[PDB]
Amino acid sequence: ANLNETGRVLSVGDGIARVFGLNNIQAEELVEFASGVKGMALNLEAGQVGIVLFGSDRLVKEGETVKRSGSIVDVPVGPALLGRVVDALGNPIDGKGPIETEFRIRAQVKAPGILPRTSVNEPMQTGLKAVDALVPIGRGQRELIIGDRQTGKTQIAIDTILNQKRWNYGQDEKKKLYCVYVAVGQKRSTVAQLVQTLEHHDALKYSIIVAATASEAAPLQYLAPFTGTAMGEWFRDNGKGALIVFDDLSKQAVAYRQMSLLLRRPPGREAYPGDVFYLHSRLLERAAKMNEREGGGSLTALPIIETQGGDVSAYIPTNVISITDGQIFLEAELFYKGIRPAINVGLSVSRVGSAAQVKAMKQVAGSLKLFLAQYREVAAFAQFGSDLDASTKQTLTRGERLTLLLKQKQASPMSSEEMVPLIYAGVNGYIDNIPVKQVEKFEAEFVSYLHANESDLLKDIAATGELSKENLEKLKSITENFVGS
Amino acid sequence: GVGSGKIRTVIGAVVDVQFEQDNLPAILNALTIDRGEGNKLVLEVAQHLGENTVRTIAMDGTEGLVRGTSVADTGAPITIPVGRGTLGRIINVCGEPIDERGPIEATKFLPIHADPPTFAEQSTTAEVLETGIKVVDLLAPYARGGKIGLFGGAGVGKTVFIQELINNIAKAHGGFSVFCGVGERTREGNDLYREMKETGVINLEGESKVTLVFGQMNEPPGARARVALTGLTIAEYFRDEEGQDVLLFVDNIFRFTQAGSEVSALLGRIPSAVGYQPTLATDMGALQERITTTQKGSVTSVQAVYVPADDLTDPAPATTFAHLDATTVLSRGISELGIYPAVDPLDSKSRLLDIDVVGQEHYDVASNVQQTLQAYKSLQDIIAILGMDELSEQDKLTVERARKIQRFLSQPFTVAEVFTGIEGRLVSLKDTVRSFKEILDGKHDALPEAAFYMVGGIEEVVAKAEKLAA
Amino acid sequence: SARRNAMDNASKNASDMINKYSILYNRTRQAVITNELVDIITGASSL
């Protein structure tokens, strides 16, 4: 009888439910069917309501009564979600008890304006020496992880999460960083294995995993990045620092293409809807560093875009690259060359990371990147331009040692005090004597002995983090003592 | 007729409003759906579907909208506060401040949509603008009171190039300025807003000089498509009513065309090539023609243009070429080498490359530079296969000169202090004319090619040569 | 007298590479015209 807060279903098909009634329903309002399946009403038409399903269409028949929820799609937030595996809606799926909720934040929240923002200066050490030295990331920055299939995009994001363990032991809040991993379109076994990998390093108890596997309905895969961002936006608004990794956005646009094409919304380029750019624009823009009057918190977003044959000119990636504050291109061709991570430095770049990079590294990394900027040009032509000229051949025996030094095994984040000695031995070229077969093992115990030799040389960086001219006189005294090993 | 109308349907960012007969609002009007507080929802009338039904485009988010709510008709397009009181304020497309520094002081109000100046009132201005960059004020000089475009894809140095032109011109230029941001990053506006408070252009103690109207990429496509028409209204008021020479930096104008494609699909339009809207040249032409220098005042515009996937054949930038007086194409291959600015020294053209504007001297200097760089690019295969030894004695010298030139084209920008650590260097216009001739003649054919990287002027190349030799 | 044998075979192996890269270009153009028109036909005949 009443069709203002309830309504009967006209037709349900492939997750799309057209319901008659709901005269007082809002746009993007969560609804509840008579079979426990949720859903939100995207397009409010004249005489009917287009509702997508957060589940299966098997339990819904024609004429099913549809109760409302009277609220836009919101999700639980707070610190009581740290260490829990949840879906896109917020319901726990790890089985470790229900979710204690502090407050709730909408899934579709407008990004903060200009004035509540401030210039980024807080660093975010990923642990990778090839990243923090060449493409530094600040807190509130948008650094894209774009690459082809199985080139190391996921493993780079994990190394950033595992690296932030050494700051969750202390009490300093400016260095704290809580991680968020939003699995979009993956399989149940991969995400579950990723949880145990994060539980194998005590990295789960400060990170929140939002699982939207491939079996779930397309509205769930679409909403998972937005809900994950809102769950990390709670830390931003309360002064704390947060980090979220979208893995990935290339499969989210596929799910958003289903909701659009099945709600009879007109398609655009490459069968994707028109606002496929606005799908990602309002998502990454919600990550920034805010004023001290607004809390002083920061949320950093790491999106992942899987290309097809290195095609950086495809529809979806060209949009994302135009949004982020830089990208980290992973070329599958450099992976077999030995370079791991296969970071094509000639294309990856950060923008406002130069002033966010550590001062102890900027003192040695500012010139370091430009040594490879020359090396990629000369090393590519030593048999094509077949002229045996030893005039500028010194750059070849210099870059091949540092580019081989940028290697780093999987899930092995090197600390700031563990990376600065290696770079100084590379920029100066004082390790060119050792062959290309023992340099990878030279680094293995060049870091370990420095702890036993001078444990008071790492406690200063743990408090200050800056190396002055005094240590420059000591580094020269440390260098010459271990050149014969 | 200001009254009420009811919502019939809400689909994404497209909301249709049902009106009563003889109360139908005209097209390009402003409809207000009342939310209790400020920053209430505004709608832009796009089509007359018939049966007293109007299809509008949202200027904000449509979440929370309920079918049947009343919709007010202001009987006029989106009218923004215009005047000298807009300087130093951060305003959205609706005409409301978002810097929470209070209301906007103004008297006369003007709509965002207006007919462009007729052919009888057009003004022909062939005036050179002294920028401060060597490659700019040589090969492709900018035209004061004209329309300048910056191209290239994502990561070639378009926004940094603008932040450099602000530092150089906004204080050398006497008239006011309007910086409208169309669908760009929000932090880049904040990183620019702080520099406004420190450059002296914007101050909170005294009345500022520039107006900031920003419509970021987080705002729905209805806002990005009309925010360029908002900042344009402020510039035209300084041209028609104040009669001042105004700077109109647009970044980025590609989002205006892109936002029109995200709405055209939902408005039931047959998609054109590359998923673009049928009203491609007209919608751009209805904005590029209003940005022109009339006989009352003058408006200079430096519009950065994003190039999708580095594809200059894309319909969006290709239509922009016909509107610009001077183009500055940024090639990605130049950025990969480490040369900034990545201005393509052959594709960057200008209308003021004539002997009637700068003289026969400047026109002949820039002519030999391009011929040299074209002859150097013609020998790209030989150098990589036959080496330097297998060349004639004439083009050998040109190769030795072109390498010095294209490395001397690079200039450390004042904003590029954080990217290179090198202090910014600024040169004049006529200093570059004699500096290149001393390179083309052979007077300075003894200095190394690495002494031209990141230096400004020819008298500084020698200063670096003495230190590097020792 | 052996440079030519390394420059004559470099001409018959380049021509054998031009043909295979001229047919592929005609294939890719033929794929662009369709996969873009189909993208228009889908969007146009959606109404």
Binding site: G309, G310, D311, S313 | A309, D311, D381, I385 | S1, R3, R4, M7, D8, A10, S11, A14, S15, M17, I18, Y21, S22, L24, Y25, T28, R29, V32
Partner: peptide, 27 residues
Amino acid sequence: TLREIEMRLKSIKNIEKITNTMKIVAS
């Protein structure tokens, strides 16, 4: 891809310009 085909054509088509003009020069 499509963008690089014509780019890779102009290289190979102009490599033919070099090798064919080094067979008679050696004669």
